[PDB]
Symmetry: C2
Subunit: 120 residues, 2 copies
């Protein structure tokens, strides 16, 4: 599963960016990791995957497998682009939490796809 290996590498990339405070980049890598993980399911099934977004691919996948609502919810958060809070701790705290959340979401999607691939 080339797409799965690449998903896991993107996740590790995200986690590295997170550790170093690069919250924007962690978000970006997380989106890519989730995308690649879902494509790995399409590749195993021999089916064409249309679209760019994680919501696109999970929606298509829903015709064949049950996709938990919370994963679609996470996907929609990951799909969003990677100010009224003050500079310093308020902004950095918000960004750090947001980036951790998105990394966790990508990881969740990866592990769901792993669970699916283990069974098909």
């Amino acid at each position: 599963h080339h797409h799965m290996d690449a998903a896991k590498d993107d996740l590790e990339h995200a986690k590295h960016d997170l550790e170093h405070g690069f919250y924007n980049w962690a978000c970006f890598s997380s989106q890519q990791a989730a995308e690649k993980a879902v494509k790995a399911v399409f590749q195993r099934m021999g089916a064409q995957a249309w679209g760019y977004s994680v919501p696109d691919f999970l929606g298509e996948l829903s015709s064949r497998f049950e996709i938990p609502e919370e994963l679609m919810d996470h996907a929609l958060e990951l799909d969003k682009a990677c100010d009224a809070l003050p500079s310093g701790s308020p902004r950095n705290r918000y960004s750090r939490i947001e980036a951790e959340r998105l990394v966790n979401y990508a990881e969740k999607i990866i592990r769901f796809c792993e669970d699916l691939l283990s069974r098909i």
Copy 2:
């Protein structure tokens, strides 16, 4: 060209990792950027792109467009995985140069694909 925008973002990611001394990750991002750039050509042509590697996609592209030898050469370098030199300056210098090279190669491929897309 969603794939092209994503290629350019991967390139920026690579350059960010390079700036911070993350030479391994810069290599990884460069591979992804080059892959996405070539896929953007397939998408515009409406053709299916088989494979994982940049050499895979450039080889397929050769049946339709002339691909300069030096770009295939760069692609093969980018395709490689991301010790007898001493720790410290010798190793870091080698790694820094190698990562700069790979980032430049990905950029070259991106700009070639841009030039192609501008004309088709």
